[PDB]
RNA sequence: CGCUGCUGCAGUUGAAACGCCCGUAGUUGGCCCCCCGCCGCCACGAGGAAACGGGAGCGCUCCAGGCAGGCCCGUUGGCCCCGCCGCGUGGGACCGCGCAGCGGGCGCGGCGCGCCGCCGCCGCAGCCCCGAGGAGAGCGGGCGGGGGCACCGGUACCGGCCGGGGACGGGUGAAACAGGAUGAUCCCGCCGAGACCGCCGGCCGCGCAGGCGCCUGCCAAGACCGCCUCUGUCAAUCAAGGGCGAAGGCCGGGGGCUAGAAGGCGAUCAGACACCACCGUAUUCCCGGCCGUAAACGGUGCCGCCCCGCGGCCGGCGCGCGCGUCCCGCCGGCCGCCCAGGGAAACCGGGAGGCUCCGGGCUCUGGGGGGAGUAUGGCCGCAAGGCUGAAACUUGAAGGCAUU
RNA sequence: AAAAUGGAUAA
């Protein structure tokens, strides 16, 4: 079931039926809004934001208490990263794999997961290109990828 | 082993060939 | 391009003679002299060979002894590994 | 026909095994195809019962024990008797005898 | 990937039926699944059902009076010509009498007797008897 | 599995069938063509030939018999083949150089029964029909 | 017991995995905590995986736990 | 002749899931958004050569025939078929493909409409489906003979010692060859070497398989679970291609203890040049290469979903109990028995069940038994060989599970 | 510890 393995499990997060803002205490539309984006100009990552407003707020989802998703609020505001943010996480690992492999040839079992981690963003980045999230100019190349890191 | 032998000795034959070719070739 | 299909590119010179094997040690015996290496100092791919064993970084300008063939070779990055430990004992 | 399901091995989910020789044949099985079962006894023939510790100067010893497992292949074992050819309703029965 | 959503749900209605299970139950619902129950139970074969809309995959409620014997889908939805509904009809019919073949056409889902009476074709969904 | 269950996977469906299908042994000996060039007959329901030496083949260990046959020379591609001559006392009627028809044993080329090395009949015998020279109805 | 999935006891669907629910939904909810100068709600994630820290003060309420984040201080039912 | 399998094949053992993974062609794909275009489509048409197939009538004396015939429809001789992915009219289900603001006016746009405009004109709710028991991610929490690199102990075995010290010592089925008064075997204190990681070691665990078990240190990695995190179909399965792949082999360095292909040797018998001893080279070990095979096995492809009780283990993860490493379990696996049910049966039953009451998708592979993985044509390899892969020709059985 | 063999053809 996962891409990558014989693996079929269903470890999942979860949203409310009732799909209404937090009744708890939750904040003021703009000023959660503007909350998000102040974050993410300390450099949060969207991941993270969802998770802050979560265990630091009143609400996982920002949706229900915003009216759309955190990268759409974010985005308005210019935050949306440059690179998607799913694209990029994996691209730092494969970097990291790349780094343990410069010391040693000997690991196998690293370069089979560096042959697993840079599949996915040739899939992942040839999903954004077309949706045009991606430019078409941009390709993961392995040599460059520190370059396209920063 | 039975089927084994079997094989290499179709294997011998088919080296057997290759010199004999070269002889000839 | 494609100017040898095997490997045999460093040992195209030498041209039909000399035999496939002995030909195949020098395709890596001699991509090794040719090849640059990393100062040390500098961290600058620039070492070459200048004579056997003299090495010398092209833009560093410092001299370091090296393996005949390789600025580093192997039997001595075993010896310099132990000297590491061995001084840290008395320390 | 399969005899057994388990197919004459415990091996399960690994699909190797570490190999080791029987006692007797030196054959070489590996661990889950092996019988190995535990060995404890006095070290001098339960014969000699207390005729060594009569003899034995120091109060209160005890005759030692060795305390080995023995490990047959399945061949030796079948013809040595540690084991014998069950019939096809006794071979899913298990309970050490 | 769940290929297709109808072949498991009919599936599983049918094995409720088999172990009795008065109360079945189908996990991912599709308009056509609605429409082929609606079918179902307008023929009386299933006695009623609905879906519990949870804002996700909605699952459906299917309850079956007992009396069903096999429901299948037929997937390749191979488009049939009006003129030889019945040959299709031949090899997934039990008796020229009894039986059900639901079809998609323009009008909407229709069974086998209301196509023929338009001498209507459309691609079989599946058979219910 | 069968498989290949798509709307647009006619194409690999067609091709799918029509590779297999060789594997099948009788289509495969029927439309190779193998055995059009092979059969020395050359697909012929009957072809003539010319006596080159009669012959006694033994026959399988559970019978035992001498089988009598002819070796024959066939006039259309020369193929030395070797047919079985029928019935009782038919040896007696072919004679060495001697034109003679040849025809299949009907098990569709394959040996028939026990004779070991023939696939072929003998019809007829310099023209006049075995049978009839059999049934005296023409003799010699 | 003539109970069908169209109506489950409650108990039925808090016991099954939060997908495995004739209504799937959140496992989880917001449990409070005590902290200095309160007697209020301080509320927070039940299950947080990240640290969260005392209103105003360095040191962090909830310990890091893969499952419900477990505390130091004082705390509060669910929501009150 | 469901012996070609679209309807409608078989692949656990009869013949046959490629060792595995990555993956582009193809091929296949959740849910959802009545009410319009382009499809595919759905139905009906029109127009397409008769013969021919059928088909209405008609006694060639029957008929196979024929368009005849009779005081007859303008007497006949019709009629349905050329299938036709062509061309029209209709209808919108399923099924795909649709980026993009709408609008009024000026426009009766030089016989009516249009285009490209022209603006704010305040008209329009202007414009974020949902979050797959699909994934891609994020954090936390533990799990593990999972991988690399070092660091690294322990005995064993073998070789060299020194102090004995006193005779045969191995060796086997019984022996024999070797070792010994050059003091053997035996002990005990060493010393050198390389391998190997015992017992714990398992219906244990981990890895994509092959496989994986001394000590610490060190890096990177992986499922699973938890989850009021994030996107938002990014999916499935695979040609071609890319990686990995026990053992043995092979190439270039090294090593070198023990086993030990070959080789010698003893006994062994008719002969054993075999089995059992004894000696031993390659090999085993290591680092960089090739090779590309296995009874690579669960002889069971890969994702998907429902499916009955009793279980054991294992990894998280909860709720109550007294509060325990309890009890009920919730998920991911590892397994044993098995209810249906299936099958020729052995038997699978967490499928080999939900099939002749046959149709979720993708891929491979077979078609009686030999010849035959043979020949040749490639291609790859240093080779050894691997992958693809014949035919002529033969034969009646070969073969599966069972019962006596 | 040492033990190899048994024509064909029907019964």
């Not at chain 6, 040896?91 to 003679?100: A, G, H, K």
Request: with cysteine.
């Amino acid at each position: 079931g996962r891409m990558h393995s014989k693996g079929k499990g269903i470890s999942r997060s979860a949203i409310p039926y009732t799909r209404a803002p937090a009744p708890w205490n939750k904040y003021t539309p703009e000023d959660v809004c503007e909350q998000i984006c102040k974050l993410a100009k300390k450099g949060t990552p969207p991941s993270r934001i969802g998770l802050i407003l979560r265990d630091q707020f009143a609400i996982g989802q920002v949706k229900n208490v915003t009216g759309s998703k955190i990268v759409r609020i974010l985005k308005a505001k210019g935050l949306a990263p440059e690179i998607p943010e799913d694209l990029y996480c994996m691209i730092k690992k494969a970097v990291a794999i790349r780094k343990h492999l410069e010391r040693s040839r000997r690991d196998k079992d690293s370069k089979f997961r560096l042959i697993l981690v840079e599949s996915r963003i040739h899939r992942l980045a040839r999903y954004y290109r077309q949706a045009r999230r991606l430019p078409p100019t941009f390709r993961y190349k392995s040599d460059q990828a520190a370059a396209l890191l920063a | 082993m039975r089927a084994k032998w079997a094989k290499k000795r179709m294997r011998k034959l088919k080296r057997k060939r290759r010199h004999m070719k070269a002889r000839s070739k | 391009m494609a100017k040898r299909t095997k490997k045999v590119g460093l040992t195209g010179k030498y041209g039909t003679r000399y035999g496939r094997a002995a030909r195949k040690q020098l395709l890596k015996i001699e991509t090794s002299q040719k090849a640059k290496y990393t100062c040390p100092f500098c961290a600058k791919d620039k070492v070459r060979r200048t004579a056997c064993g003299i090495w010398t970084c092209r833009s560093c300008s410092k001299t370091m002894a090296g393996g005949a063939y390789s600025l580093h070779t192997e039997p001595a990055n075993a010896a310099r590994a132990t000297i590491r430990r061995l001084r840290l004992a008395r320390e | 026909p399969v005899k057994r399901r388990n197919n004459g091995r415990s091996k399960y989910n690994c699909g190797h095994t570490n190999i080791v020789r029987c006692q007797n044949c030196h054959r070489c099985v590996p661990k889950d195809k092996v019988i190995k079962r535990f060995t404890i006894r006095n070290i001098v023939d339960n014969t000699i019962a207390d005729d060594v510790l009569n003899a034995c100067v120091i109060q209160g010893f005890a005759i030692p024990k060795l305390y080995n497992k023995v490990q047959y292949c399945v061949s030796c074992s079948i013809h040595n008797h540690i084991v014998r050819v069950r019939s096809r309703e006794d071979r899913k029965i298990r309970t050490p005898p | 990937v769940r290929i297709n959503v109808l072949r498991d749900a009919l599936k599983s209605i049918c094995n409720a039926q088999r172990i009795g299970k008065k109360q079945v139950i189908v996990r991912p619902s599709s308009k056509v699944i609605i429409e082929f129950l609606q079918l179902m139970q307008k023929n009386g074969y299933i006695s009623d059902f609905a879906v519990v809309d949870n804002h996700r995959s909605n699952r459906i409620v299917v309850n079956l009076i007992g009396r069903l014997n096999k429901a299948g889908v037929i997937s390749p939805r191979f488009d049939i010509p009006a003129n030889d509904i019945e040959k299709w009809v031949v090899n997934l019919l039990p008796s020229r009498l009894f039986g059900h073949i639901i079809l998609t056409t323009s009008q909407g889902i229709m069974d086998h007797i209301e196509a023929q009476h338009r001498q209507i074709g459309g691609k079989v969904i599946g058979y219910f008897y | 599995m069968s498989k290949t269950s798509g709307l647009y996977t006619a194409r690999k469906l067609r091709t799918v069938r029509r590779v297999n299908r060789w594997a099948d042994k009788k289509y495969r000996k029927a439309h190779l063509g193998t055995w059009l060039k092979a059969n020395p007959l050359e697909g012929a329901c009957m072809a003539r030939g010319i006596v080159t030496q009669k012959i006694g083949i033994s026959a399988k260990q559970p019978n035992s018999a001498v089988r009598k046959a002819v070796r024959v020379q066939l006039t259309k591609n020369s193929k030395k083949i070797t047919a079985f001559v029928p019935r009782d006392g038919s040896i007696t009627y072919i004679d060495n150089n001697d034109e003679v028809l040849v025809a299949g044993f009907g098990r569709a080329g394959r040996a028939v029964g026990d004779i070991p090395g023939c696939r072929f009949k003998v019809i007829k015998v310099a023209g006049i029909g075995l049978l009839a020279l059999f049934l005296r109805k023409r003799e010699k | 017991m003539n109970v069908d999935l169209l109506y489950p006891d409650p108990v039925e669907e808090q016991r099954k995995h939060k997908l495995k629910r004739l209504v799937q939904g959140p496992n989880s909810y917001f449990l409070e905590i005590k902290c200095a100068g309160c007697q209020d709600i301080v509320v927070v994630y039940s299950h947080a995986n990240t640290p969260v820290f005392c209103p105003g003060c360095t040191s962090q309420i909830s310990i890091p736990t893969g499952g419900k984040c477990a505390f130091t201080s004082q705390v509060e039912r669910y929501r009150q």
